[PDB]
Amino acid sequence: KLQDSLDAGVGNLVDADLAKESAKLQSLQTKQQLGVQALSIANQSSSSILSLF
Amino acid sequence: KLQDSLDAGVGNLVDADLAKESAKLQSLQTKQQLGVQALSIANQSSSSILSLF
Amino acid sequence: LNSINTNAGAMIALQNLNGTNSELTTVQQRINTGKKIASAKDNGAIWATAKNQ
Amino acid sequence: LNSINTNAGAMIALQNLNGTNSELTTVQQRINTGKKIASAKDNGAIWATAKNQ
Amino acid sequence: LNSINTNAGAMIALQNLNGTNSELTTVQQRINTGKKIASAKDNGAIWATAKNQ
Amino acid sequence: SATAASMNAVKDSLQRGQSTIDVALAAGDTITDLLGKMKEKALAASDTSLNTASFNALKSDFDSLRDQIEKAATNAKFNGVSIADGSTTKLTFLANSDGSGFTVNAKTISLAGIGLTTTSTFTTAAAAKTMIGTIDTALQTATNKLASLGTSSVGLDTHLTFVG
Amino acid sequence: SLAGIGLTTTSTFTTAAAAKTMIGTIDTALQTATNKLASLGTSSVGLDTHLTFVG
């Protein structure tokens, strides 16, 4: 019984509760797509200078 | 009686507790599928670079 | 500032994207391992305590 | 770091998947053999005592 | 509210699922032990009364 | 512009220190698993009810794990430099363009550094009963050293982000 | 081999007392062979652990 209790205590200290990461994964994937699109938009700022010449 | 005691001692030494294996097997199968999915997500990091070009 | 030699907005966007990729890598390791403290880099005190336990 | 050559996160995920596969094959052999010490590799000293007994 | 940094509905669904898990765990433990009160945690007063009796 | 261009060397030294600490952490994982197996070996040898052959086999397994710890500590090098081999007192990595460092004290994890010895063993049950606590202290100091190295690596990564 | 476990290619018994001595001879041979196999298994586990660290 004491060995089972120690293993349960190690699992409490260390184990991740994966149901939260199941949502955080999709959220961070949407964040990565939005950030890549925002960077692609930010890269284009130099293009406007050519229209003035 | 002595031979029975010796065989019981060998069984105490080497025999597995299969009831714990019945839980560890299912947990490791779920963990293996989760690790395969996580590695598959890790493989895709290069694809974001194409959007910037 | 309509400079062509420098683009600060791309710099800030790349920093935000790098932070998003870091968070996604953390979630990836936490899913594939099943542990929120898989190594001494995650949290050294709780990690050493769990190892001794 | 947005390298198109090195992919450190995939290597880390592959290491965790290899460790999970090792634990799973260990559980498979322990389930089919019925022993937690089926051979000298599992524990040479206990295997020796069990063989002599 | 269309945030990518927060998901309160997933939190409430997690709370409800954890409560259902607690009910399923206490019921399976009651089926296994065969008693509505198998330990002092279940109900200490009638537990001590049943121990003395 | 020169001060900004000089920061690439700072980032390079920071990542080099991170990789060195990573190799040390892998060797420490090996050393901790070996120390745990040595613990159950000494704990079994402490029992007086065993016959001589079982105590001898436990002694042989203990010596084998000890030699394995010595080799695993020997091999923990990143390109000829090591924070855990015990070959140096400390490593330093650039923290700024002026050459100010980011000191990382070495944490030796060889048998000499964890309080053990190349010839440590037990020849009697009382010697195994003392080796129980000896291995406990060794594993505890090893986990403390690895925790300090991991905290140093996280600090290296944080300063890397600030330098960028 | 038979030379490595304390026996011989011509080892045998021709009398009951020789068989009673061979009982202990076979005991010592089985014990030494089993200890050798245990050391080989420990060496194999060490090779696997070093393989993981090398990767």
Contact status of E16 with chain A (Cβ, < 8 Å): no
Closest among F68, F148, F44 to F106, alpha carbons compared: F148
| Chain B residues with CB-CB distance to A40 below 8 A | 51-52
Query: Would you call G39 an interface residue with chain D, using a CB distance cutoff of 8 Å?
Result: yes
Which chain F residue has the Cα nearest residue G53?
F26
CA A36 to chain centre: 13
Phi, psi of C34 (to 5 degrees): 80, 10
Coil, strand or helix: which one is F160?
Answer: helix
> DSSP label at F97?
T
- Compute the distance between CA of residue F154 and CA of residue C44 in angstroms, rounded to an integer: 10
Minimum distance, in Å, between the CA of residue C12 and any CA atom of chain F: 11
Could you tell me the domains of chain F? 1-164 (1.20.1330.10)
Residue D29: closest CA among D41, D13, D18: D41
* B contacts of C21 (beta carbons < 8 Å): 45
Question: Which positions in chain F touch D49 (Cβ < 8 Å)?
Answer: 53-54, 57
Q: Which residues of D touch G34 (CB under 8 A)?
A: 47-48, 51-52
- The experimental technique used to determine this model is cryo-EM
Number of separate helices (H) and strands (E) present in chain G: 1, 0
Side-chain-side CA neighbours of G5 within 13 Å: the count stands at 19
Contact B34 C28 (CB under 8 A): no
- Closest approach of chain E CAs to the CA of A44, in angstroms? 25
Resolution (A): 2.5
Got the DSSP string for F21-74? HHHHHHHHHHHHHHHHHHHHHHHHHT-TTS-HHHHHHHHHHHHHHHHHHHHHHH
Question: Checking DSSP bridges between strand F90-94 and strand F101-105, what pairing results, if any?
Answer: antiparallel
Is the CB of residue D16 less than 8 Å away from at least one CB of chain C?
yes
Q: In degrees, to the nearest 5, what angle opens at C-alpha D43 toward C-alphas D37 and D44?
A: 120
Among residues D37, D45, G45, which one has the least CA distance to residue F41? Answer: D45
Q: For residue C33, which residues of chain D lie inside 8 Å, CB to CB? A: 16
* Residue in the block written with tokens 């120390």: F35
Q: Tokens for E23?
A: 């009910």
* Look-up of token digits 């001060």: F3
Contact B23, D27 (CB under 8 A): no
Which candidate in A20, A25, A29 is best for mutational testing of the E interface (most E CBs within 10 A)? A20
Is residue C29 within 8 A of residue A10, CB to CB? The reply is: no
> Considering only CB atoms, which chain G residues are within 8 Å of D47?
34, 37-38, 41
Name the one residue in this structure whose structure tokens are 């799973």: D24
Candidates A7, A22, A36, partner chain B, best to mutate (most B CBs within 10 A): A36
Tokens encoding B35: 């690790």
Q: CA–CA separation, F149 vs C40, rounded Å?
A: 8
Residue E16: which H helix or E strand, with range? helix E8-33
